[PDB]
Enzyme design. Structure first.
Site, PDB file in Angstrom:
ATOM      1  N   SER A 183       0.852  -1.159   0.000  1.00 54.89           N
ATOM      2  CA  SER A 183       0.000   0.000   0.000  1.00 54.89           C
ATOM      3  C   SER A 183       0.900   1.223   0.000  1.00 54.89           C
ATOM      4  O   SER A 183       1.837   1.209   0.797  1.00 54.89           O
ATOM      5  CB  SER A 183      -0.890   0.205   1.240  1.00 54.89           C
ATOM      6  OG  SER A 183      -1.408  -1.011   1.624  1.00 54.89           O
ATOM      7  N   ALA A 186      -0.338  -0.736   5.978  1.00 49.49           N
ATOM      8  CA  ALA A 186       0.066  -1.729   6.991  1.00 49.49           C
ATOM      9  C   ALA A 186       1.484  -1.475   7.502  1.00 49.49           C
ATOM     10  O   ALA A 186       2.380  -1.140   6.736  1.00 49.49           O
ATOM     11  CB  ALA A 186      -0.089  -3.111   6.387  1.00 49.49           C
ATOM     12  N   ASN A 234       5.097   0.838   2.698  1.00 51.87           N
ATOM     13  CA  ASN A 234       5.330  -0.278   3.619  1.00 51.87           C
ATOM     14  C   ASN A 234       6.832  -0.464   3.959  1.00 51.87           C
ATOM     15  O   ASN A 234       7.426  -1.521   4.205  1.00 51.87           O
ATOM     16  CB  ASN A 234       4.768  -1.596   3.127  1.00 51.87           C
ATOM     17  CG  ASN A 234       3.299  -1.683   2.754  1.00 51.87           C
ATOM     18  OD1 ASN A 234       3.026  -1.772   1.539  1.00 51.87           O
ATOM     19  ND2 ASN A 234       2.347  -1.686   3.690  1.00 51.87           N
TER      20      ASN A 234
HETATM   21  O1  LIG Z   1      -0.654  -2.152   3.462  1.00 51.85           O
HETATM   22  C1  LIG Z   1      -1.308  -3.222   3.453  1.00 51.85           C
HETATM   23  O2  LIG Z   1      -0.777  -4.328   3.443  1.00 51.85           O
HETATM   24  C2  LIG Z   1      -2.849  -3.172   3.471  1.00 51.85           C
HETATM   25  C3  LIG Z   1      -3.369  -2.259   4.543  1.00 51.85           C
HETATM   26  C4  LIG Z   1      -3.613  -0.970   4.142  1.00 51.85           C
HETATM   27  C5  LIG Z   1      -4.090  -0.039   5.054  1.00 51.85           C
HETATM   28  C6  LIG Z   1      -4.341  -0.480   6.344  1.00 51.85           C
HETATM   29  O3  LIG Z   1      -4.873   0.387   7.277  1.00 51.85           O
HETATM   30  C7  LIG Z   1      -4.056  -1.780   6.770  1.00 51.85           C
HETATM   31  C8  LIG Z   1      -3.593  -2.689   5.856  1.00 51.85           C
END
Ligand SMILES: O=C(O)Cc1ccc(O)cc1
Ligand SMILES: [Ca+2]
Lengths: 195, 557
Positions: free
Chosen positions: B1, B69, B241
């Site tokens: 993300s 995430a 991420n």
């Molecule tokens: O980044 C990810 O893997 C997905 C995700 C996106 C936003 C969030 O708040 C939690 C998980």
């Protein structure tokens, strides 16, 4: 009026909820969720509680056991039992709103039941606050916040220990799975802070 | 993300711009749900996964929020000491404590029911047991017993009007998640939220610890330890991420690393390229980063150095010259199935060869299979999630950096051979494989593009729609499942906020029993493919002005 909930949908079908207190507000939200995404929500609910094999059969028994092994339902109910009345209203509002639309759907299925319920042979059931909370636990806490490979890490370590000897096995392990690497591009610039 | 937040000093024709692209995979019906909530303290607009009570992406007219995430290490495994005699017990702090246990019956349509038991200790649910060693593994989460509070924090944060009010709610969100803030005055912020264990000295968080008492966590670290930054010197916050901060340790996953090779650099180069960005340019980064090959940047300098002394008729050199002329942006041909340049196919084959010769070779079977993937692996339906740099490629990048890498090379991955000899052997392998299938004229190589599937099964592998409801898009795009943009204090409008999103295929997934599909079942799908977006409304006047229907309910609790 304290009893009124007004639902306005826009040009893309996006619902806006107008309500005066917590319970009416989230009741509206649940109600349009049930109108737009009932079958998706129903499969999500079974997915997050491990009740898929009841409607879909033997191919999902391992899945259902794995889902139930990964949480403790009594712990979730105890957290719900400690909410204040305002917080509880959010969850109860939402389940009640869903239930209102699921009541009309089960009462007039010739026009209101989502096609996929007929296709897969089963009908929607009523929701409680525990089901709302398990949607989030199941798909947010368990998908993105439960990751660990510690047991597999130890099996790799041991294997590197056998191939390169005890100290050398560890130094290779830190080469492949370092704890920290100081050259990683970070969201926070070093000028602002460091762990 | 990914996420980019642009503040006051970097924004052009606005005070703040937030662009979020959460990557959860692509589904039918849509992973997130659009919803506006007006009353009881709430005045919000946006979209949120599985229609949670709290909106993960949206704004309230004063502030805006977004998420990615987190990937911190918040789960550790406790090796519990069992006993052959006195089963259901485990040693903890010098006494034999009994396990919590529960029985479960799995009812099966057209099958027999199945019952089994779930075991739990003070550390958590038992994952697995080793009867030979009389050991049981308990998975212990720092957020255990705070699930419901995390859902409520995500709900209550929709009411915050400032940084202070917002971080009060970010402190209660216990899952490892990055939260992002923007407001009408042009302030921008970031918090790497969650509950992290306060571990005992000498605890390596990458491997299991004994659960007999001495290694138990001391508690949780305070919220002041959580990485966070408000109004950064740079003028922007970007994340894919990628590590929050210098020296922050990442998840203990063997396939997960924060190293010198990171896909967030691709976002940073674009935001650093321009002194200020408009709303339309911030939205445009979605399209560039969607199509960018992530390995080109990393290994082009190594390929160039190794083929520098080669003649022009040497095929290995021709491959590197093709790469050198390419900017790394993949574009579909007119056929809608092949890419215009063969770059990704070349790096894919090369990288696979390079890893087989280096990382794979140093690791014993069967763990060598963990480090072989090039990161281009898909099937005919396309990738199920984002494209990233593979673990093995991140490990190989450290190795080609030499003593410029901070990571001690305990084993020489090149095994005594000069780097260039290994690079050239892999390039020979690449030429052999590709020329065999496409021939020797590199200029007419039409290599297969990746495609994109909106799947009918949810992420667990469970049906959430019928199989014919699957949707197919010709161009794979490394982008959020949804994309949403909030622009605060636009100089070009009288509105204090302007926000957009795109929720494909559509808001509705309803299909009547006669097979009539809802009007809003798929009216957002072509919009997704061409990088378009629709307006999100907040004010009453805007909602009335774009109203397509109304329904009033009278209900008493
Ligand atoms: O980044 C990810 O893997 C997905 C995700 C996106 C936003 C969030 O708040 C939690 C998980
Ligand atoms: Ca750990």
């Amino acid at each position: 009026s304290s009893s009124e909930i007004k639902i306005v949908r826009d040009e893309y079908g996006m619902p806006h909820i107008y309500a005066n207190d917590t319970w009416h507000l989230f009741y509206g939200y649940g109600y349009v969720v049930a109108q737009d995404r009932l079958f998706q929500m129903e499969m999500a609910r079974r997915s997050t509680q491990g009740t898929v094999a009841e409607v879909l059969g033997k191919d999902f028994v391992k899945f259902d056991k794995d889902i139930r092994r990964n949480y403790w339902p009594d712990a979730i109910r105890a957290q719900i039992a400690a909410l204040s009345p305002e917080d509880m209203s959010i969850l109860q509002g939402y389940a009640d709103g869903m239930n209102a639309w699921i009541d009309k759907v089960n009462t007039n299925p010739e026009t209101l039941l989502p096609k996929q319920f007929n296709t897969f042979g089963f009908t929607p059931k009523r929701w409680e606050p525990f089901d709302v909370a398990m949607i989030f636990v199941g798909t947010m806490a368990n998908r993105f916040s439960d990751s660990t490979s510690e047991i597999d890490n130890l099996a790799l370590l041991t294997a590197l220990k056998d191939k390169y000897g005890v100290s050398q096995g560890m130094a290779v392990f830190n080469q492949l799975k370092w704890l920290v690497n100081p050259s990683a591009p970070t969201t926070i610039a070093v000028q602002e802070s460091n762990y | 993300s990914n996420m980019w937040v642009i503040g006051k000093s970097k924004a052009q024709d606005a005070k703040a711009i937030m662009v979020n692209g959460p990557q959860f995979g692509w589904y039918a019906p849509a992973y997130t749900y659009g919803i506006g909530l007006h009353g009881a303290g709430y005045d919000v607009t946006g979209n949120t996964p599985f229609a949670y009570p709290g909106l993960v992406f949206g704004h309230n007219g004063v502030i805006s929020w977004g998420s990615t995430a987190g990937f911190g290490d918040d789960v550790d495994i406790f090796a519990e000491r069992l006993s052959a005699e006195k089963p259901g017990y485990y040693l903890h702090n010098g006494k034999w404590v009994k396990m919590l246990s529960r029985e479960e019956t799995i009812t099966v349509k057209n099958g027999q029911a199945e019952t089994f038991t779930v075991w739990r200790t003070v550390h958590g649910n038992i994952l697995q047991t080793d009867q030979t060693t009389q050991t049981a593994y308990a998975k212990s989460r720092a957020w255990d017993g705070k699930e419901v509070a995390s859902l409520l924090a995500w709900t209550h944060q929709m009411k915050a009007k400032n940084w202070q009010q917002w971080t009060q709610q970010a402190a209660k969100q216990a899952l490892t998640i990055n939260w992002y803030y923007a407001d009408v005055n042009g302030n921008i912020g970031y918090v790497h939220t969650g509950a992290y264990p306060d571990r005992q000295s000498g605890h390596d968080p990458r491997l299991p610890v004994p659960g007999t008492g001495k290694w138990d966590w001391k508690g949780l670290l305070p919220f002041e330890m959580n990485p966070k930054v408000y109004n950064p010197q740079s003028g922007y916050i970007a994340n894919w991420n990628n590590s929050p901060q210098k020296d922050y340790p990442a998840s203990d996953l063997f396939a997960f690393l924060w190293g010198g090779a990171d896909r967030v650099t691709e976002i940073d180069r674009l935001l650093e390229q321009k002194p200020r960005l408009t709303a339309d340019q911030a939205w445009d980064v979605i399209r560039q980063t969607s199509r960018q090959d992530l390995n080109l940047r990393l290994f082009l300098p190594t390929l160039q150095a190794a083929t520098s002394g080669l003649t022009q008729s040497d095929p290995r050199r021709q491959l590197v010259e093709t790469l050198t002329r390419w900017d790394g942006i993949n574009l579909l041909n007119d056929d809608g199935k092949t890419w215009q340049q063969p770059g990704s196919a070349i790096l894919n084959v090369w990288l696979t060869s390079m890893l087989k010769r280096t990382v794979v070779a140093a690791v014993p079977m069967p763990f060598d299979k963990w480090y072989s993937a090039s990161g281009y692996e898909t099937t005919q339906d396309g990738p199920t999630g984002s494209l990233n740099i593979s673990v093995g490629a991140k490990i190989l990048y450290e190795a080609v950096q030499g003593d410029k890498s901070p990571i001690p090379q305990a084993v020489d991955l090149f095994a005594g051979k000069p780097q260039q000899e290994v690079v050239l052997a892999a390039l020979e392998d690449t030429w052999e494989t590709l020329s065999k299938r496409y021939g020797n004229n590199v200029s007419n190589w039409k290599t297969p593009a990746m495609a994109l599937t909106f799947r009918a099964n949810n992420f667990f592998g469970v049906p959430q729609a019928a199989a014919e409801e699957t949707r197919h898009q010709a161009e794979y795009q490394n982008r959020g499942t949804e994309n949403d943009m909030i622009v605060f204090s636009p100089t070009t409008s009288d509105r204090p906020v302007l926000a957009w999103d795109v929720v494909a295929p559509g808001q509705s997934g309803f299909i009547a029993p006669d097979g009539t599909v809802d009007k809003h079942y798929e009216d957002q799908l072509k919009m997704y493919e061409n990088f378009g977006r629709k307006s999100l409304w907040l004010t009453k006047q805007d909602v009335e002005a774009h109203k397509e229907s109304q329904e009033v309910l009278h209900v008493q609790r």
